[PDB]
Design a binder for this molecule. Structure first.
Ligand SMILES: COc1ccccc1CC(=O)N1C[C@H](C(N)=O)[C@@H](C)C1
Ligand SMILES: [Zn+2]
Length: 140
């Protein structure tokens, strides 16, 4: 589990969105595994607007933050899970790192801010849904 809280937005994995998220929906995209809902309170996270390919992510199944090198956002084939069939997921970045299904939502960050959230993994890989192109998260 986990979310990004920037401005009056909450960014979560679409597959973990709650009824309150759907009832306060701003934007969702199944191909990216992302959903954004509105919040009453202002958040403290800031979004990175950069080209970093190194950062640090939070892994709840180890209670640890790990440094990682990750690929550029791309269209990658992801195997079937409890939440989606096997399909291509867009804007996904892969790294070598520990992950388990409930690690989705952990933040990946660089010196500029939040880069994305854990969305996929297995066998010593972890995949992150990028948010750096969603410029509207920084306003209104
Ligand atoms: C945290 O991910 C794992 C880690 C180890 C093993 C398996 C997983 C699960 C995993 O790969 N997915 C990909 C799915 C997607 N974003 O399409 C999502 C619903 C679950
Ligand atoms: Zn950066």
């Amino acid at each position: 589990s986990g979310a990004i809280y920037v401005g009056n937005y909450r960014v979560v994995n679409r597959h973990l969105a709650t009824h309150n998220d759907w009832a306060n929906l701003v934007w969702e995209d199944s191909s990216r595994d992302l959903l954004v809902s509105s919040t009453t309170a202002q958040g403290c996270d800031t979004i990175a607007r950069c080209d970093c390919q190194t950062g640090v992510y939070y892994c709840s199944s180890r209670r640890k933050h790990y440094p990682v090198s990750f690929s550029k956002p791309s269209l990658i084939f992801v195997e079937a899970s409890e939440y989606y069939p096997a399909r291509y997921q867009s804007h996904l970045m892969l790294a070598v790192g520990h992950s388990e299904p409930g690690d989705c939502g952990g933040i990946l960050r660089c010196q500029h801010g939040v880069v994305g959230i854990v969305s996929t993994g297995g066998n010593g890989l972890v995949g992150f849904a990028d948010v750096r192109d969603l410029l509207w998260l920084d306003e209104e």
